[PDB]
Write a protein that holds these residues in place. Structure first.
Motif, PDB file in Angstrom:
ATOM      1  N   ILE A 196       0.846  -1.187   0.000  1.00 46.73           N
ATOM      2  CA  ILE A 196       0.000   0.000   0.000  1.00 46.73           C
ATOM      3  C   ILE A 196       0.890   1.248   0.000  1.00 46.73           C
ATOM      4  O   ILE A 196       1.802   1.421   0.864  1.00 46.73           O
ATOM      5  CB  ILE A 196      -0.945   0.021   1.221  1.00 46.73           C
ATOM      6  CG1 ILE A 196      -1.762  -1.298   1.255  1.00 46.73           C
ATOM      7  CG2 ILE A 196      -1.905   1.246   1.203  1.00 46.73           C
ATOM      8  CD1 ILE A 196      -1.110  -2.375   2.066  1.00 46.73           C
ATOM      9  N   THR A 197       0.573   2.170  -0.903  1.00 47.41           N
ATOM     10  CA  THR A 197       1.397   3.346  -1.103  1.00 47.41           C
ATOM     11  C   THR A 197       0.528   4.569  -1.243  1.00 47.41           C
ATOM     12  O   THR A 197      -0.683   4.484  -1.383  1.00 47.41           O
ATOM     13  CB  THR A 197       2.257   3.256  -2.401  1.00 47.41           C
ATOM     14  OG1 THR A 197       1.420   3.395  -3.551  1.00 47.41           O
ATOM     15  CG2 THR A 197       3.020   1.896  -2.486  1.00 47.41           C
ATOM     16  N   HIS A 198       1.168   5.720  -1.287  1.00 48.18           N
ATOM     17  CA  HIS A 198       0.448   6.931  -1.640  1.00 48.18           C
ATOM     18  C   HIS A 198      -0.137   6.820  -3.047  1.00 48.18           C
ATOM     19  O   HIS A 198       0.393   6.134  -3.892  1.00 48.18           O
ATOM     20  CB  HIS A 198       1.357   8.167  -1.463  1.00 48.18           C
ATOM     21  CG  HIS A 198       1.435   8.623  -0.039  1.00 48.18           C
ATOM     22  ND1 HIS A 198       2.501   8.329   0.783  1.00 48.18           N
ATOM     23  CD2 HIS A 198       0.531   9.271   0.737  1.00 48.18           C
ATOM     24  CE1 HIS A 198       2.278   8.820   1.987  1.00 48.18           C
ATOM     25  NE2 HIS A 198       1.088   9.393   1.988  1.00 48.18           N
ATOM     26  N   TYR A 199      -1.274   7.480  -3.248  1.00 49.94           N
ATOM     27  CA  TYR A 199      -2.009   7.468  -4.503  1.00 49.94           C
ATOM     28  C   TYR A 199      -1.835   8.821  -5.194  1.00 49.94           C
ATOM     29  O   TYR A 199      -2.094   9.866  -4.584  1.00 49.94           O
ATOM     30  CB  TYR A 199      -3.491   7.229  -4.222  1.00 49.94           C
ATOM     31  CG  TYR A 199      -4.335   7.165  -5.457  1.00 49.94           C
ATOM     32  CD1 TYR A 199      -4.354   6.029  -6.238  1.00 49.94           C
ATOM     33  CD2 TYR A 199      -5.093   8.275  -5.872  1.00 49.94           C
ATOM     34  CE1 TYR A 199      -5.102   5.966  -7.402  1.00 49.94           C
ATOM     35  CE2 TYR A 199      -5.865   8.221  -7.050  1.00 49.94           C
ATOM     36  CZ  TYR A 199      -5.847   7.065  -7.808  1.00 49.94           C
ATOM     37  OH  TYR A 199      -6.574   6.962  -8.966  1.00 49.94           O
ATOM     38  N   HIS A 200      -1.455   8.788  -6.466  1.00 50.46           N
ATOM     39  CA  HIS A 200      -1.273   9.979  -7.277  1.00 50.46           C
ATOM     40  C   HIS A 200      -2.273   9.994  -8.385  1.00 50.46           C
ATOM     41  O   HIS A 200      -2.183   9.228  -9.349  1.00 50.46           O
ATOM     42  CB  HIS A 200       0.164  10.028  -7.807  1.00 50.46           C
ATOM     43  CG  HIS A 200       1.170  10.210  -6.717  1.00 50.46           C
ATOM     44  ND1 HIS A 200       1.191  11.346  -5.929  1.00 50.46           N
ATOM     45  CD2 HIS A 200       2.115   9.376  -6.208  1.00 50.46           C
ATOM     46  CE1 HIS A 200       2.147  11.223  -5.020  1.00 50.46           C
ATOM     47  NE2 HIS A 200       2.716  10.034  -5.158  1.00 50.46           N
ATOM     48  N   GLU A 201      -3.256  10.878  -8.266  1.00 49.55           N
ATOM     49  CA  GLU A 201      -4.417  10.812  -9.164  1.00 49.55           C
ATOM     50  C   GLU A 201      -4.110  11.171 -10.622  1.00 49.55           C
ATOM     51  O   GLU A 201      -4.883  10.831 -11.532  1.00 49.55           O
ATOM     52  CB  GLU A 201      -5.573  11.665  -8.613  1.00 49.55           C
ATOM     53  CG  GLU A 201      -5.255  13.135  -8.398  1.00 49.55           C
ATOM     54  CD  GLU A 201      -6.435  13.906  -7.785  1.00 49.55           C
ATOM     55  OE1 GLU A 201      -7.433  13.269  -7.365  1.00 49.55           O
ATOM     56  OE2 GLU A 201      -6.354  15.153  -7.723  1.00 49.55           O
TER      57      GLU A 201
HETATM   58  C1  LIG Z   1       3.916   1.452 -10.852  1.00 49.77           C
HETATM   59  C2  LIG Z   1       3.088   2.549 -11.105  1.00 49.77           C
HETATM   60  C3  LIG Z   1       2.225   2.982 -10.100  1.00 49.77           C
HETATM   61  C4  LIG Z   1       2.185   2.371  -8.838  1.00 49.77           C
HETATM   62  C5  LIG Z   1       1.284   2.803  -7.808  1.00 49.77           C
HETATM   63  C6  LIG Z   1       0.413   3.934  -7.931  1.00 49.77           C
HETATM   64  C7  LIG Z   1       0.321   4.980  -7.075  1.00 49.77           C
HETATM   65  N1  LIG Z   1      -0.570   5.867  -7.592  1.00 49.77           N
HETATM   66  N2  LIG Z   1      -0.989   5.427  -8.685  1.00 49.77           N
HETATM   67  C8  LIG Z   1      -1.925   5.948  -9.572  1.00 49.77           C
HETATM   68  C9  LIG Z   1      -2.265   5.260 -10.720  1.00 49.77           C
HETATM   69  C10 LIG Z   1      -3.162   5.857 -11.624  1.00 49.77           C
HETATM   70  C11 LIG Z   1      -4.028   6.897 -11.266  1.00 49.77           C
HETATM   71  C12 LIG Z   1      -4.830   7.505 -12.249  1.00 49.77           C
HETATM   72  C13 LIG Z   1      -4.790   7.071 -13.570  1.00 49.77           C
HETATM   73  N3  LIG Z   1      -5.598   7.665 -14.565  1.00 49.77           N
HETATM   74  C14 LIG Z   1      -6.477   8.799 -14.231  1.00 49.77           C
HETATM   75  C15 LIG Z   1      -6.061   9.985 -15.114  1.00 49.77           C
HETATM   76  N4  LIG Z   1      -6.094   9.589 -16.539  1.00 49.77           N
HETATM   77  C16 LIG Z   1      -5.151   8.482 -16.822  1.00 49.77           C
HETATM   78  C17 LIG Z   1      -5.496   7.248 -15.983  1.00 49.77           C
HETATM   79  C18 LIG Z   1      -3.914   6.066 -13.932  1.00 49.77           C
HETATM   80  C19 LIG Z   1      -3.094   5.474 -12.967  1.00 49.77           C
HETATM   81  C20 LIG Z   1      -1.635   4.035 -10.987  1.00 49.77           C
HETATM   82  N5  LIG Z   1      -0.764   3.502 -10.124  1.00 49.77           N
HETATM   83  C21 LIG Z   1      -0.435   4.179  -8.975  1.00 49.77           C
HETATM   84  C22 LIG Z   1       1.371   2.157  -6.606  1.00 49.77           C
HETATM   85  C23 LIG Z   1       2.271   1.078  -6.439  1.00 49.77           C
HETATM   86  N6  LIG Z   1       3.073   0.667  -7.421  1.00 49.77           N
HETATM   87  C24 LIG Z   1       3.028   1.267  -8.606  1.00 49.77           C
HETATM   88  C25 LIG Z   1       3.909   0.831  -9.607  1.00 49.77           C
END
Ligand SMILES: c1ccc2c(-c3cnn4cc(-c5ccc(N6CCNCC6)cc5)cnc34)ccnc2c1
Ligand SMILES: c1ccc2c(-c3cnn4cc(-c5ccc(N6CCNCC6)cc5)cnc34)ccnc2c1
Lengths: 298, 300
Positions: free
Chosen positions: B84-89
């Motif tokens: 579980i990690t931080h989420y980047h929208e």
């Molecule tokens: C590799 C990459 C990521 C992670 C992650 C990770 C943390 N945050 N995060 C966000 C997205 C994500 C959010 C929004 C969108 N979209 C909305 C905007 N339009 C395009 C599609 C796409 C993808 C994906 N993966 C992650 C956590 C752990 N290991 C990883 C290893």
């Protein structure tokens, strides 16, 4: 249907420098929960992998039930859940109990069978790589109600496969228990790239355990008190250097009590110990040969 | 919405990504978004490796994806493993560059933040409060996240390797996996890589970084001109190229990503072109270090 984290910890039944074991209750039944220090996290993983990928399973190897880990905020909880053995370790059992010929041989043959099972590669659907243990000792063996033993604590284990000829040593800074270390470990000549070297370290340790057990078998109406190997030449918690001087420099081994030599069984067991204790690791017996020898004296 | 017994306090909301280990989900935990990376049992070694790196190196940095938690539960024939990690929208750099062109300031901010993350991984800090050198081993635009402040962070340390001078047992783990084929350096492809030199792995990361730098640079607008997003080597290998497909172009043919001559009429693109060039030397030892790239980019 319930989760491992919901096991109720009831009482601590063992505690060392690297972890604790608890008696726990899971759906109304006893289990053993080994809780690893975060410092020994690589042992938890190695064991978990062994049990959950090789599917190690045998009457004389401690029965795996589950593994569980949760980590946050640099706090890590590392659980290995196993069959619970209420008689405790072999170390615990030998303190007061005395053995007759039948019970002594049942104990040492079951340990030999566990170890032979670990050391040998088995082919086919129910197969496994060869495994060396690297921390065999009387505190790492459990006694069961049926008088058999089972070997525990596989976290230092090393593995080998014949088809690929590949040695898998993992990466763990933990070293074996100092009291039970073979000469080649203590003088740092052990050939670390050779799988057979690790099996030979296990054979050394097995001969020391054999000695701990044989002391408690009655003959001519007497026994020796429980003592650990090298009790008379090194302190509690001996140092690497204490052990090296005794085992390598002085070439000492445990002594054999005079009374053993009028008992046929103890005489055979003394010979087996000698064959585990050669300075030259390649001279030592194999686990298979040990098992065969013991099968024939009962 | 779903919960799993591997962490009962997290609510999985939607799958946002797929990778070589499986799925990543947006989830909710104590009122905040988190990202949940779900491993198959096949890959418990990568799960453990990534966890240990975050948990014992206490790896933390603005440009390295922030760890929150790790969980696993295992029984005979059933194993679940989560990071579980931080989420980047804003999602991955790869997705972002499909949809988005960059001005000079945003381009620099992206490539500097990647360089700074990578230098923080790569740099060995000596002494009692030190840090092992870490090599990533699967650096690519899909493994970099875009943050709302315009910086990026590097993700996915499941194949990462570490080395501290003090400890004498160099270990590339025991997990049967190497890098994304498209990003593999020439020495990986022709098997000349000096596997016993920890820095060989750092130099392999530097080759991948130059490819990402090319991907990014393509999307910076210069005098009203920009290129569509393309992955590295898009014009000479198919999708999902094999080890062999790649070997042919990078080693036998000696192909590199094309640098449009037009970039050299722009100071920022000129600097970036020079940097890419110096990540792509056939000789791994001739390539720039992460730290030198960071300093050069800080000067711009
Ligand atoms: C590799 C990459 C990521 C992670 C992650 C990770 C943390 N945050 N995060 C966000 C997205 C994500 C959010 C929004 C969108 N979209 C909305 C905007 N339009 C395009 C599609 C796409 C993808 C994906 N993966 C992650 C956590 C752990 N290991 C990883 C290893
Ligand atoms: C090494 C050794 C063991 C384990 C175990 C493990 C499984 N069962 N078990 C039982 C005990 C235990 C029970 C009762 C007593 N007493 C009753 C007699 N009088 C006082 C002491 C003492 C000890 C300890 N550990 C275990 C599980 C997982 N990893 C291990 C690694």
């Amino acid at each position: 249907r319930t989760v491992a984290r919901d096991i109720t910890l009831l009482e601590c039944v063992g505690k060392g420098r690297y972890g604790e074991v608890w008696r726990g209750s899971w759906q109304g039944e006893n289990v053993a929960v080994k809780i690893f220090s975060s410092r020994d996290e690589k042992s938890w993983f190695r064991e978990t992998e062994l049990y959950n990928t090789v599917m190690l399973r045998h009457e004389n190897i401690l029965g795996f039930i589950a593994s569980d880990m949760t980590s946050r905020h640099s706090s890590t909880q590392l659980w290995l859940i196993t069959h619970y053995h209420e008689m405790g370790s072999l170390y615990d059992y030998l303190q007061l109990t005395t053995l007759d010929t039948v019970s002594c041989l049942r104990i040492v043959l079951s340990i030999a069978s566990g170890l032979a099972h670990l050391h040998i590669e088995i082919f086919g659907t129910q197969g496994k790589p060869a495994i060396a243990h690297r921390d065999l000792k009387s505190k790492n063996i459990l006694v069961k109600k049926n008088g058999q033993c089972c070997i525990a604590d596989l976290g230092l284990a090393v593995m080998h496969s014949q088809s690929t000829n590949q040695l898998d040593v993992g990466n763990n800074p933990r070293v074996g228990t100092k009291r039970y270390m073979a000469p080649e470990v203590l003088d740092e000549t052990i050939q670390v790239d050779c799988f057979d070297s690790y099996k030979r370290v296990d054979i050394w340790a097995f001969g020391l355990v054999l000695w701990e057990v044989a002391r408690r078998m009655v003959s001519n109406g007497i026994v020796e008190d429980y003592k650990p190997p090298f009790y008379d030449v090194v302190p509690n918690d001996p140092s690497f250097e204490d052990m090296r001087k005794v085992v390598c420099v002085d070439q000492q081994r445990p002594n054999i009590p005079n009374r053993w030599f009028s008992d046929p069984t103890l005489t055979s067991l003394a010979k087996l110990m000698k064959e585990c204790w050669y300075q030259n690791p390649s001279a030592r017996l194999t686990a298979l040969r040990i098992k065969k020898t013991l099968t024939k004296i009962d």
